[PDB]
Amino acid sequence: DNQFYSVEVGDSTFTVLKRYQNLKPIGSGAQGIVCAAYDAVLDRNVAIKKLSRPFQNQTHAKRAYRELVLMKCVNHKNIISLLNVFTPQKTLEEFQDVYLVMELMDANLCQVIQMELDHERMSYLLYQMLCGIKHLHSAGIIHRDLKPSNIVVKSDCTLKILDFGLARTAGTSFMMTPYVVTRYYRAPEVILGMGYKENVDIWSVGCIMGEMVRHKILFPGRDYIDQWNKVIEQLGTPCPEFMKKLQPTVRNYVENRPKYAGLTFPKLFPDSLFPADSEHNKLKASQARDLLSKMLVIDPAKRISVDDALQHPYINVWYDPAEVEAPPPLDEREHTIEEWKELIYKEVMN
Numbered sequence: 001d002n003q004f005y006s007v008e009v010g011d012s013t014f015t016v017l018k019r020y021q022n023l024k025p026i027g028s029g030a031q032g033i034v035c036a037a038y039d040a041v042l043d044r045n046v047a048i049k050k051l052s053r054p055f056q057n058q059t060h061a062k063r064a065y066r067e068l069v070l071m072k073c074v075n076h077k078n079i080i081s082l083l084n085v086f087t088p089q090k091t092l093e094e095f096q097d098v099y100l101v102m103e104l105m106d107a108n109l110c111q112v113i114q115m116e117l118d119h120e121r122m123s124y125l126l127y128q129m130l131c132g133i134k135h136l137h138s139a140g141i142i143h144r145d146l147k148p149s150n151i152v153v154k155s156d157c158t159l160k161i162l163d164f165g166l167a168r169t170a171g172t173s174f175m176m177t178p179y180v181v182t183r184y185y186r187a188p189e190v191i192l193g194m195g196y197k198e199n200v201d202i203w204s205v206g207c208i209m210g211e212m213v214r215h216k217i218l219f220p221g222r223d224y225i226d227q228w229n230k231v232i233e234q235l236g237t238p239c240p241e242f243m244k245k246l247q248p249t250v251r252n253y254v255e256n257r258p259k260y261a262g263l264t265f266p267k268l269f270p271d272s273l274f275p276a277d278s279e280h281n282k283l284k285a286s287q288a289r290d291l292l293s294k295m296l297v298i299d300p301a302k303r304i305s306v307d308d309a310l311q312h313p314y315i316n317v318w319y320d321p322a323e324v325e326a327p328p329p330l331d332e333r334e335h336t337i338e339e340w341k342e343l344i345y346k347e348v349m350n
């Protein structure tokens with residue numbers, strides 16, 4: 001008879017294939033509509049995300065479509081891999097929700113950030129983030145919105161990036177919803193609408209790394225006004241060659257803001273935030289601070305590249321020979337609700 005069954009999880013109704021049993025809300029994190037479940041066909045635990053009416057607006061539609069298309073043609077151990085895609089609805093006209101199935105992880109990166117972590121775990125997580133970012137870049141994907149909530153880890157320290165970031169050759173839109181966008185890991189180029197290269201994501205890694213060390217969000221704020229103030233208070237006002245690459249209007253505001261000297265990296269990340277129990281840890285702390293000082297650089301021309309960050313003494317220890325490639329093996333334009341509903345549906349049907 002029926003291939004699917006419905007279950008009430010939290011507030012939402014999950015209508016899933018009968019193979020997925022004992023659904024449980026993840027909550028943190030999430031929050032997207034995400035459940036843990038047992039997959040009886042694969043005899044393994046999975047995570048199931050529900051996209052409710054993803055074609056309801058262009059923000060939801062572009063993202064849903066882009067991430068459905070990319071989750072198929074992107075293959076890397078540090079990037080989310082899709083196990084299954086389905087809709088409980090029978091026709092295009094009846095089509096409402098999309099379900100995305102992936103391997104169940106144990107935590108998001110925010111939970112790991114709260115922990116006091118050794119240099120082994122810190123550099124391993126960062127090596128993985130850098131590998132995932134390098135793979136995305138090689139496929140012409142520059143993220144620009146990498147944050148700990150969309151990064152997941154397993155107990156064995158393995159890491160996966162969940163999303164593909166900001167829309168390329170676009171272009172943001174209005175949201176009539178009660179949810180807040182996290183902007184604290186965004187690069188100065190993203191804050192000040194500058195134009196960017198691959199190392200735009202290194203800033204995000206720097207923000208995450210710094211927060212793993214400091215246990216506080218490095219650059220907080222209501223919006224980009226407060227946020228940019230947090231950047232300059234700590235790192236100092238950038239040099240004239242950087243400010244020359246700003247739009248006239250943006251350049252005016254940036255230069256007319258009060259000038260700060262900038263705190264040094266030993267002052268920003270004191271010796272006390274790292275273990276001093278051994279000579280190994282003494283060396284690891286100076287190397288960790290050295291990498292942070294190269295990542296948390298306002299000028300992208302003076303900021304470290306992904307490839308150099310991977311070759312850094314703090315990270316380069318995880319470089320594994322005979323690991324490459326992998327052991328197991330359009331369209332940024334304006335569309336209407338109905339046009340997107342069809343694009344997404346045919347992508348769900350493949």
Ligand SMILES: Cc1ccc(NC(=O)Nc2cnn(-c3cccc(C(=O)Nc4ccnc(C)c4)c3)c2)cc1
Nearest residue numbers: 028029030036047049100101102104105106107108
């Ligand atoms: C295709 C797709 C599916 C889901 C997401 N979003 C997502 O958050 N996925 C995901 C995977 N794992 N986790 C996660 C995060 C935090 C905690 C837990 C957790 O509690 N996991 C367990 C629960 C019970 N047993 C075990 C062994 C782990 C899982 C989230 C994006 C794309």
